Ligand binder design. Sequence first.
Ligand code: NA
Ligand code: NA
Ligand code: NA
Length: 157
Amino acid sequence: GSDPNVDRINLVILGRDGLARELANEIRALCTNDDKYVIDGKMYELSLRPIEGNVRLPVNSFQTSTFQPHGCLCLYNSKESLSYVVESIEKSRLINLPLTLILVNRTAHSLIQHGQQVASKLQCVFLDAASTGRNINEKQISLILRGLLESKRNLNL
Ligand code: NA
Ligand code: NA
Ligand code: NA
């Protein structure tokens, strides 16, 4: 269970073709051995749920009996991986869940254009981390996590 003295972030990471595993691995490299992530000198419990396959399947559901999601980090770098994000979100709709759509490193014009329309439709923030492996800068990870903590307090997640 969650330590009542340490704030918990339950983060879904959504991305096919190994995108979710890769970002989850990066984030865990930044964590303590008991999965704490430090922000502004403060410890947070960080639970990660990387998803790459069909979210219809129980094993791939956003929410489980011990995991209530607080946000979802959506990753893509291609037509197919963008399509996977839309399919997964619209199908598992989790609707007021804070979402972040991130374009990562692997056409460039169309991926940005479509990403922005998808983010508009899903009502979420769009970040271009491709210019910035298929990783994301750790400072950007911390910004997203800070944002989730405030959302968590506003939406009572
Ligand atoms: Na807690
Ligand atoms: Na976890
Ligand atoms: Na996990």
